């Protein structure tokens, strides 16, 4: 049977769905309990933590613009996600999405993670680039398992101080 | 390091590879040795075999329209692929994608199969339905592994040959 449905019109779908691709939801998964996990990812939204994430990642910016801020061979590095840009990110090459538009969106496809394959959550040193604090998690749901992870980052002053220079990251906001 | 290159526009990308979106060629994958298998599928095309993918398959009909013949619940069903749709198809439901507006583009996902996961390939007879042939393969590359598979059944009366009724498949074109 078709588990997942239909087919169905994408843009409509984004329109219908507007009000939750914003402040304070801003993505909505597509299809729940699937292996491909396919969701849309709006704005505005900034961040400060890295993904570690173990498989690749698909993107395809559908409307407006967006910037994932990369470590690539040991530098700080930024990939443009214009509007009609795709890009396939490689497993473990650390992200950080910005998504500055209102009205904007991303499909992004990623897969399910197979029991002992986690993924990680970082966060570096605006001052002297080393890292402060990494979180690994058996990613199952996106909603519960991730949110008190930022939490308890932010809500922490041990976890956000640089062991190289001992300088307190700013949390939520850079 | 972004083993997968930096992102780029996807509209150009198509436009520019049309001469392989159309026969003989038909389809185009966009990164190679990636476990993301991301291809557009163009037109026209027709084909009478039907696939048992053993992982699900994500297609989002970017230009033009396309349909895909399925097996769902032992009956015969058809599932539209109108321009601007998106769907997710599940592991095991038998598909026979149709295409046939030329210029037409659709956005195709699926995953690398692991060693001893295989992929079947599928006709069924005109006349009473019956399963007339099955082979089954591991795909590790579209381009050498399939093309051979389907001229054999075309070649052959034997294979093509229903065991219910006896009746013979035409092979190529139904
Ligand atoms: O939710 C994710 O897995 C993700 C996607 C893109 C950037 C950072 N994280
Ligand atoms: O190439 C495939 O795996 C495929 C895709 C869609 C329909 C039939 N086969
Ligand atoms: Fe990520
Ligand atoms: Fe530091
Ligand atoms: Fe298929
Ligand atoms: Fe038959």
């Known amino acids: 049977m078709l588990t997942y449905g239909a087919p169905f019109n994408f ?4 329109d219908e769905h507007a009000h939750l691709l914003k402040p304070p939801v801003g993505n909505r998964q597509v299809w729940q309990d ?3 996990i396919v969701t849309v990812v709006g704005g505005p ?3 400060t ?3 570690d994430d173990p498989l690749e990642e698909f993107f395809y910016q559908l409307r407006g613009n967006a910037y994932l801020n990369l470590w690539v061979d040991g530098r700080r590095e930024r990939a443009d996600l214009k509007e009609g840009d795709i890009f396939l990110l490689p497993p473990h090459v650390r992200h950080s999405p910005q998504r500055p538009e209102a009205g ?3 499909l992004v496809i990623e897969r399910q993670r197979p029991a002992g394959m986690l993924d990680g959550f970082e966060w570096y040193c605006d001052a002297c680039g080393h ?3 990494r979180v690994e998690v058996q990613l199952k749901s996106i909603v519960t398992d991730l949110p008190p992870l930022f939490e308890s980052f ?4 041990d976890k956000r101080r640089c062991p190289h220079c001992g300088q307190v990251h700013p949390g939520r906001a850079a």
């Open 154 to 157: 932010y809500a922490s002053e």
């Open 45 to 47: 939204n900034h961040r």
């Open 49 to 51: 933590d890295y993904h």
């Open 131 to 133: 890292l402060v604090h």
């Open 11 to 14: 843009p409509r779908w984004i």
């Open 104 to 106: 904007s969106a991303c």
């Open 34 to 36: 699937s292996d491909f």
